[PDB]
Design a protein around this ligand. Structure first.
Ligand code: K
Ligand code: K
Ligand code: K
Ligand code: K
Ligand code: K
Ligand code: K
Ligand code: K
Ligand code: K
Ligand code: K
Ligand code: K
Ligand code: K
Ligand code: K
Ligand code: K
Ligand code: K
Ligand code: K
Ligand code: K
Ligand code: K
Ligand code: K
Ligand code: K
Ligand code: K
Ligand code: K
Ligand code: K
Ligand code: MG
Ligand code: MG
Ligand code: MG
Ligand code: MG
Ligand code: MG
Ligand code: MG
Ligand code: MG
Ligand code: MG
Ligand code: MG
Ligand code: MG
Ligand code: MG
Ligand code: MG
Ligand code: MG
Ligand code: MG
Ligand code: MG
Ligand code: MG
Ligand code: MG
Ligand code: MG
Ligand code: MG
Ligand code: MG
Ligand code: MG
Ligand code: MG
Ligand code: MG
Ligand code: MG
Ligand code: MG
Ligand code: MG
Ligand code: MG
Ligand code: MG
Ligand code: MG
Ligand code: MG
Ligand code: MG
Ligand code: MG
Ligand code: MG
Ligand code: MG
Ligand code: MG
Ligand code: MG
Ligand code: MG
Ligand code: MG
Ligand code: MG
Ligand code: MG
Ligand code: MG
Ligand code: MG
Ligand code: MG
Ligand code: MG
Ligand code: MG
Ligand code: MG
Ligand code: MG
Ligand code: MG
Ligand code: MG
Ligand code: MG
Ligand code: MG
Ligand code: MG
Ligand code: MG
Ligand code: MG
Ligand code: MG
Ligand code: MG
Ligand code: MG
Ligand code: MG
Ligand code: MG
Ligand code: MG
Lengths: 118, 114, 16, 56, 123, 209
RNA sequence: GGACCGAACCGACUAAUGUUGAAAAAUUAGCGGAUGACUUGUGGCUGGGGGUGAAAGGCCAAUCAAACCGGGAGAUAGCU
RNA sequence: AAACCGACACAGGUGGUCAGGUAGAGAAUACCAAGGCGCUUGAGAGAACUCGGGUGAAGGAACUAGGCAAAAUGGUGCCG
RNA sequence: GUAGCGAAAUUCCUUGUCGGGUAAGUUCCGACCUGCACGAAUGGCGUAAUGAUGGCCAGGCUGUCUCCACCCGAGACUCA
RNA sequence: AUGUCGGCUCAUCACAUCCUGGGGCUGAAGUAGGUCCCAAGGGUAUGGCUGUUCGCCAUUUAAAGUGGUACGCGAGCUGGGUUUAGAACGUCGUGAGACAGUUCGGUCCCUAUCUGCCGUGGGCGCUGGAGAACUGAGGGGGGCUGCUCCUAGUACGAGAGGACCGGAGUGGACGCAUCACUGGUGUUCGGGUUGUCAUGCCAAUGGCACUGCCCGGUAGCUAAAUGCGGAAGAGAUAAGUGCUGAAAGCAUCUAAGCACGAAACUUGCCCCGAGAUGAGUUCUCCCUGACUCCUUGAGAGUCCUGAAGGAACGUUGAAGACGACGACGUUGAUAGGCCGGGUGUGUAAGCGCAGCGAUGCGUUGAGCUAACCGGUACUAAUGAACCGUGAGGCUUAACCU
C-alpha cells in the first residue's frame, strides 16, 4: 500500500534521486526547456518551482538555501537575477509540460518541460 | 475539516498555561475514591509535549519512592484540574527521553534564566 | 524404517 | 513443473485471443498546422492547440 | 505486559528480590498479565533470612509495569520497572507486611485493599 | 425501521464531565430525499429510495435526471434503498433528517472498508509465519501446505489463500449514538466505522438491540 | 620462539544465496594459519597393479578399489 | 584481462615491479590525488512473495535438535 | 584381570540408584559398583597449556521467539 | 523410483463426546459425582527432559477428546533421528570386515502446461439500445467459554457445607473494523556530530563513509492501541417427558388425535449472489429518413442520419500487480504549484555585543518544515473525433377500434 504517499521512487535510491533532480533542475534553469521522460518531468516540477519561489525574495540566506539545493553558482545567479524577477507577479505554475512522443531506445513516454515565459 | 474543527474547539480549555520541555510542572488531577472527589498533585519534569489541538498531551516524569514514574496527560481532559510551572528548564531538545537513562546529578536540568 | 536413500547427485557428462 | 501433454494449436490460439493490439482510437488534427498528432501531444512540427510551442 | 519468563522486582518485604513469571493465570492461552493480574512465580533471588526461599513457587499480583496502565480519559501511567507483590498460594493474600514504591488505583478492590493501605503512594 | 445515508467526516473524541474520553466517528447526515417509493402492487416489496448530497448538472446523465425529475428532487450523489417495516409510510419528495435518530440508542453502520490490494495469507488470514532462521529456505511468509495427499487429491473450496483484501462492504453492529445534532447535520457514534474519511456510510437502527 | 594480535598471501569452520548458477564447487558476511613441519615462480624427476600419499583408498589433466588412447573386439550377455 | 586459463565480451584463476595526500600503528579502513571507470537492455509501477538491508512497544532463548542466525563486545593509557 | 579407572566415545537391562543444578533436567556434573561387554605401549590413570573439536550451565545481548509491524533497495507486475 | 521418522505451516472429515448443550437411572439430601442415552455447533495449554512420536514431570484450563485423511501435508519449510563414503569404543571375527550396540562428522533440485484452489479481468449471451435501483434462487461467514455479584447463606442438611430456575456485571481466547487516543515505523521533515573531499579563502554549505553514526518526528501503514461481534427470537425435531386413547371392559405417550423438548437441523445476524441460460423486477432516458435489388424475408445494398449513452485520451484517487473501480476535464479545485494555517524540529543565516579563545548572549521560539487542513485557475486536464443507430420477430390470447 502507498495510501496518501507522495513522491516517485523512479527505480533509484534516495541519494541518486536527489542528485538527479539537482542536476536536472540546473539543466532546466540554464536551458529553460529540456526533454525528459514524462514521470521525471512531473517530479521535476516539485523541485524547480520551489527554487523559483525562493528566488523571488532575494537575501543572503535565500541565496545560500538555493546554493545548498543546486550547488551551482551560475544557477543561483540566474535564479535571483533573472527568473525571480521574471516570475515576481506569478503565483506558482512557472513550468509547463508538453507531451511529445516515445523514445526510440526504450519506448519511454517523453515530454518537454519549459519555463512558462520562455 | 470545519465540522471536526468546530466539535474540537468547543471542548478545548482556554486556560492552559505555557510550558516547555524541561519545565518542572505540578499537575492537579481529580481522584474519585467512591463519592469523594479530591485533587492529587503530580509534580515532575515535562519530557515531551504533543501539540495536536484537542488531542494535545504532555508527559511528566518524576522519581517517586525510589521509582521512576511517567504520566502522559491529555491536556484538555476534565480530569486535569490545573497545571502550574514551578521551574523553567533550559534544554535544547523538544523531547527529553535521554533523562530515562539518567539519575541524580546527571538528570539535573539547568534553570532558564530570563 | 527408511525404504529409500537420501537423494544424491549424478556425475557430470558432456551434455547435448 | 512441466506439461505432461503437448498443448494443442487450438489452446495456443485461445490463450492468444487477448494478445491483439488496439489501433489508436482517433488521431487529432492541429487547428493551425493541420498536422495529425496524438491527442494531448505536440505535433511533429512542434505545434500544440494551434500554438507553435517548440522549435524543430 | 508480563509473560512467562519475565523477571520482576518485588515491591514488598517478603524477602524475595527477583522473581520470574512462570504462568499467567486466568484463561487458556492467556498471553499477558498487566497491573492487577495474578501470576504464578518462582523465586530466583531471596535475602538470607526471609519469609520465602529461592526456588519457591507461589503467586503474585503485578503492581507496576513498564508498559503501564491506561486511564478512562486516555492518559497513561508507566513505571521504570516491572514489580509484583508475593501472595500466599492458597489464600491469595500478601506475604509481606510492607509495600515499597508507588502502586496504582487498579488495585482498589476488596482483594488487594491491604496492598493499597500499605502502599506509600497510590496513583 | 429505515436508515439514513451519510458521509464519514472523521474521528475525534468527546470528553465527559466525569473524565471519560469517548472515541467518536463523526458522520455528516444531510437531508435524505425520497426519490421513489416501492410497494407490493408494483414492485413486490415495500421500500423507499433516497438520495443525498448534490451533483453538478453536467455530470447527471439524462436517464438519471429524468428519475430525479419525476420525484421532483435535486440530483444527489447516489441512490440507496431502505426496506420499510409494516408501520412505516413515506411520500416521494419527502426529506428525512438525522432527527430520525433522536431516540435511537444503537446503530449499525455499513461502509466500504479501506482497500489493502493483494494481501498475503499472513495479513489476510492471520496465518503464522514460519521460522525466520534455523535453515528455512525461501519460505518465511508462504502459506505452508494447502491440502492432504492423493485423498482427496484436490484443494477444497474456501481454502484461505492470498488475494484482494478490503475494499468490500462491511457492517459494524450496535454502536452507541453519542450525539445527534440536527442543526449541524451530525451523528456522533462511539468507536470506529468502516471506510476512509469522505466515504459513504449507511446508518440504520441496530438490528440486534 | 613450529610465541601473540593482525593485512598481503595460503587456507576453508558456520550461515544465507545460488542449484536449467555469474560459477560443472562460486558469491556475501563472518572464520583458521600468517618466520614456518610457511608460501610462491621457473625448470626437472617418479607412470598404471605402477607412481605419489603427515594415510582420506586420497591424488595421478573437471576421469580413479586400478588413468587415458588405440587394439584383441562384433568379448560374453541362460538378461531387458 | 572482452586479447591469457575457464565452451561465453563468464562475479572464478593468473608470477614480478611501482605506491601520492588527510586521518591511521598500518600495504587495515574512510575520504581523495595521479590515473581510470558508471560494469552493452531500457522505461514505468511501488501488490503478494522471494532476496539483501534498516528500525521496533512490552517481554528476553519462552525459539530450536542446537542461541542456527542475529544482536552484542570491540581502541589507547593507567589501575586491577 | 594386579594398579588404576568404571552406567564411561565402553552399561544391554536403563531415563539404574543417590546427590547437585531447574518450577519442571531421557542431556550435564559428583558419586555408588550389579564392569550385559574397562584395564595397563592395537598402552592404564592423571594432566597445566592449546582446539573453526563433543556435551552441559550462567551473565550480557538480542525479531530466535511471544507476534509480528513499518521502512529502504534488488526482482516480481506493466510497456518497448 | 509411489522420498521415508519427528518438528513446522496449513488443514479437512468421522463420532466410539474431552468441554460446553439436552436427558433417564443412581447404592442421586445438598454440593459434588457415578453410569447410560441424545448431541459433532464451536472450542479443545504453555513449558522442562529427549531426534523423538510417546512418556514422565512443572504449571495452567471449561476442556487439554479418540481416530481417518499415502501412520494428511518435503514440485510447502526443516533435516535432529534413520541407509552412503571419515573416525573411535564395547563386542564378534585369524582377517578383510561386522553389530539384540554406542559415539563425533557429514550436498534436501524443479521458472506450474492440465486439474484444483485464491483473487481479478476480457468475450458473448440474456431478443431495440442505454443509465440506475433492486428482488433473492442459491452459496459462504459466524456460532467457544470463565469468574464475580444478586436471587440466598435461601431450598437441602444433625452439622459441615450449600443449590436448581432466573437476572446483572466483568474477563480469557477468537474474529471484524478503525487510527480519536497510547505507541511502532517514518532512507521524502528538522536537528546534533566523527573522518575526509569540494565549493578561491573565511563564514556558510554540499558529496561520501550502512540513512556515516545518532536524536527527535509529519502523513500513511499499523498493534501492543480501542470500538464492535458470538445472541435473543421463531419453526421443525433428538434422547426424553407427557395428555387424551383404544386394539386388549383394565392398563398403556401411540395405533387415530394432541402437547412439550438441545450449542445439532431450518430460519433469524453478516457477506457474495440473475451466466438463477429458470439469464427475474422497478424507475428513467434515446432513436419516428429516402431509395434500389433479389433465389422474397428476421434478405442484401446505396445514400442520408449518428441519439441516449459508451469508450478512448488527459489530470488523477486512503482504488489498484495489470485489467478493473472512483473523482475530475475550463460551464473546472482532478493533480502540481502558490498563499495562509497546522505539525515537526528547536532559537537559522547575517549582524552586533562579551570573551585571549573554544564558545556564550541579543536580534529570536528563530529558521526550515514530506505525504496534512483551508483557500487559489498560476501550470496541465482541447475544438473535436471514435463506437453505439434510425421505433425493435412470429404465434396465440385478452382488451381496445
Ligand atoms: K614447476
Ligand atoms: K591400471
Ligand atoms: K586427460
Ligand atoms: K580489454
Ligand atoms: K506494479
Ligand atoms: K558403573
Ligand atoms: K563395555
Ligand atoms: K600393538
Ligand atoms: K603415558
Ligand atoms: K579444531
Ligand atoms: K485430525
Ligand atoms: K461438536
Ligand atoms: K507414503
Ligand atoms: K508430488
Ligand atoms: K520449493
Ligand atoms: K489434467
Ligand atoms: K494511531
Ligand atoms: K505515526
Ligand atoms: K562534511
Ligand atoms: K438478468
Ligand atoms: K491544486
Ligand atoms: K516553529
Ligand atoms: Mg496525494
Ligand atoms: Mg527496472
Ligand atoms: Mg549515502
Ligand atoms: Mg505420464
Ligand atoms: Mg497473452
Ligand atoms: Mg488501497
Ligand atoms: Mg510461530
Ligand atoms: Mg538450498
Ligand atoms: Mg531466507
Ligand atoms: Mg476424483
Ligand atoms: Mg605463530
Ligand atoms: Mg587442503
Ligand atoms: Mg570469505
Ligand atoms: Mg594471526
Ligand atoms: Mg575406508
Ligand atoms: Mg581429477
Ligand atoms: Mg583390474
Ligand atoms: Mg576374440
Ligand atoms: Mg557387443
Ligand atoms: Mg558485459
Ligand atoms: Mg573475467
Ligand atoms: Mg595467487
Ligand atoms: Mg583498501
Ligand atoms: Mg583523476
Ligand atoms: Mg519493494
Ligand atoms: Mg537491526
Ligand atoms: Mg523489541
Ligand atoms: Mg525496548
Ligand atoms: Mg535481560
Ligand atoms: Mg527451550
Ligand atoms: Mg518448544
Ligand atoms: Mg552464531
Ligand atoms: Mg552482527
Ligand atoms: Mg542416567
Ligand atoms: Mg537423578
Ligand atoms: Mg535451559
Ligand atoms: Mg558421570
Ligand atoms: Mg580398550
Ligand atoms: Mg603388558
Ligand atoms: Mg597392549
Ligand atoms: Mg592413547
Ligand atoms: Mg516483454
Ligand atoms: Mg453418539
Ligand atoms: Mg444453528
Ligand atoms: Mg505421513
Ligand atoms: Mg525443497
Ligand atoms: Mg508433497
Ligand atoms: Mg566407515
Ligand atoms: Mg445459512
Ligand atoms: Mg457455514
Ligand atoms: Mg491521525
Ligand atoms: Mg512516536
Ligand atoms: Mg528515524
Ligand atoms: Mg578548496
Ligand atoms: Mg570553514
Ligand atoms: Mg566525492
Ligand atoms: Mg569514493
Ligand atoms: Mg454459547
Ligand atoms: Mg509549532
Ligand atoms: Mg544548520
Amino acid at each position: 500500500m502507498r495510501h496518501r504517499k507522495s513522491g516517485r521512487q523512479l527505480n533509484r535510491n534516495s541519494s541518486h534521486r536527489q542528485a538527479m533532480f539537482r542536476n536536472m533542475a540546473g539543466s532546466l534553469v540554464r536551458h529553460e526547456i529540456i526533454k525528459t521522460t514524462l514521470p521525471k518531468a512531473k517530479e521535476l516540477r516539485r523541485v524547480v518551482e520551489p527554487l523559483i519561489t525562493l528566488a523571488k525574495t532575494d537575501s543572503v540566506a535565500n541565496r545560500r538555501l538555493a546554493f545548498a539545493r543546486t550547488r551551482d553558482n551560475e544557477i543561483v545567479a540566474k535564479l535571483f537575477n533573472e527568473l525571480g524577477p521574471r516570475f515576481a507577479s506569478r503565483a506558482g505554475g512557472y513550468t509547463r509540460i508538453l507531451k511529445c512522443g516515445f523514445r526510440a531506445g526504450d519506448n519511454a513516454p517523453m515530454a518537454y518541460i519549459e519555463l512558462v515565459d520562455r | 475539516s470545519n465540522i471536526i474543527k468546530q466539535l474540537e474547539q468547543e471542548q478545548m480549555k482556554q486556560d492552559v498555561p505555557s510550558f516547555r520541555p524541561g519545565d518542572t510542572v505540578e499537575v492537579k488531577v481529580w481522584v474519585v475514591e467512591g463519592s469523594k472527589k479530591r485533587l492529587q498533585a503530580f509534580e515532575g519534569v515535562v519530557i515531551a509535549i504533543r501539540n495536536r489541538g484537542l488531542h494535545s498531551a504532555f508527559t511528566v516524569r518524576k522519581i517517586s519512592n525510589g521509582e521512576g514514574v511517567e504520566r502522559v496527560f491529555q491536556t484538555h481532559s476534565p480530569v486535569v484540574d490545573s497545571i502550574s510551572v514551578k521551574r523553567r528548564g533550559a534544554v535544547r531538545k523538544a523531547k527529553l527521553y535521554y533523562l530515562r537513562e539518567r539519575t541524580g546529578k546527571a538528570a539535573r536540568i539547568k534553570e532558564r534564566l530570563n | 524404517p527408511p525404504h529409500r536413500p537420501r537423494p544424491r547427485p549424478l556425475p557430470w557428462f558432456p551434455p547435448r | 513443473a512441466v506439461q505432461q501433454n503437448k498443448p494443442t494449436r487450438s489452446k495456443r490460439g485461445m490463450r492468444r485471443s487477448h494478445d491483439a493490439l488496439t489501433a489508436v482510437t482517433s488521431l487529432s488534427v492541429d487547428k493551425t498546422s493541420g498536422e495529425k498528432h496524438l491527442r494531448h501531444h505536440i505535433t511533429a512540427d512542434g505545434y500544440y492547440r494551434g500554438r507553435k510551442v517548440i522549435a524543430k | 505486559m508480563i509473560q512467562e519468563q519475565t523477571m520482576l522486582n518485588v515491591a514488598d518485604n517478603s524477602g524475595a528480590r527477583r522473581v520470574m513469571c512462570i504462568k499467567v493465570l486466568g484463561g487458556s492461552h492467556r498471553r499477558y498479565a498487566g497491573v492487577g493480574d495474578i501470576i504464578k512465580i518462582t523465586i530466583k533471588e531471596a535475602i538470607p533470612r526471609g519469609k520465602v526461599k529461592k526456588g519457591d513457587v507461589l503467586k503474585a499480583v503485578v503492581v507496576r509495569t513498564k508498559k503501564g496502565v491506561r486511564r478512562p480519559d486516555g492518559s497513561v501511567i508507566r513505571f521504570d520497572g516491572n514489580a509484583c507483590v508475593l501472595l500466599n498460594n492458597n489464600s491469595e493474600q500478601p506475604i509481606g507486611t510492607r509495600i515499597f514504591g508507588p502502586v496504582t488505583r487498579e488495585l482498589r478492590s476488596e482483594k488487594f485493599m491491604k496492598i493499597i493501605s500499605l502502599a506509600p503512594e497510590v496513583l | 425501521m429505515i436508515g439514513l445515508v451519510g458521509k464519514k467526516v472523521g474521528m475525534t473524541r468527546i470528553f465527559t464531565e466525569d473524565g471519560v474520553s469517548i472515541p467518536v466517528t463523526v458522520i455528516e447526515v444531510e437531508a435524505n430525499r425520497v426519490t421513489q417509493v416501492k410497494d407490493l402492487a408494483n414492485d413486490g416489496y415495500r421500500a423507499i429510495q433516497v438520495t443525498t448530497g448534490a451533483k453538478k448538472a453536467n455530470r447527471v446523465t439524462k436517464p438519471e435526471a429524468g428519475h430525479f425529475a419525476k420525484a421532483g428532487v435535486e440530483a444527489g450523489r447516489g441512490l440507496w434503498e431502505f426496506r420499510l417495516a409494516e408501520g412505516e409510510e413515506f411520500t416521494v419528495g419527502q426529506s428525512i433528517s438525522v432527527e430520525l435518530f433522536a431516540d435511537v440508542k444503537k446503530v449499525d453502520v455499513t461502509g466500504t472498508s479501506k482497500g489493502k490490494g493483494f494481501a498475503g495469507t499472513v495479513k489476510r488470514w492471520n496465518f503464522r509465519t514460519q521460522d525466520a532462521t534455523h535453515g528455512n529456505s525461501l519460505s518465511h511468509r508462504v502459506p505452508g501446505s494447502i491440502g492432504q495427499n492423493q485423498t482427496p487429491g484436490k484443494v477444497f473450496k474456501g481454502k484461505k489463500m492470498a488475494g484482494q483484501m478490503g475494499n468490500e462492504r462491511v457492517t459494524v453492529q450496535s454502536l452507541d449514538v453519542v450525539r445527534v445534532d440536527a442543526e449541524r447535520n451530525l451523528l456522533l457514534v462511539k468507536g470506529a466505522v468502516p471506510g476512509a474519511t469522505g466515504s459513504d456510510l449507511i446508518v440504520k437502527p441496530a438490528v440486534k438491540a
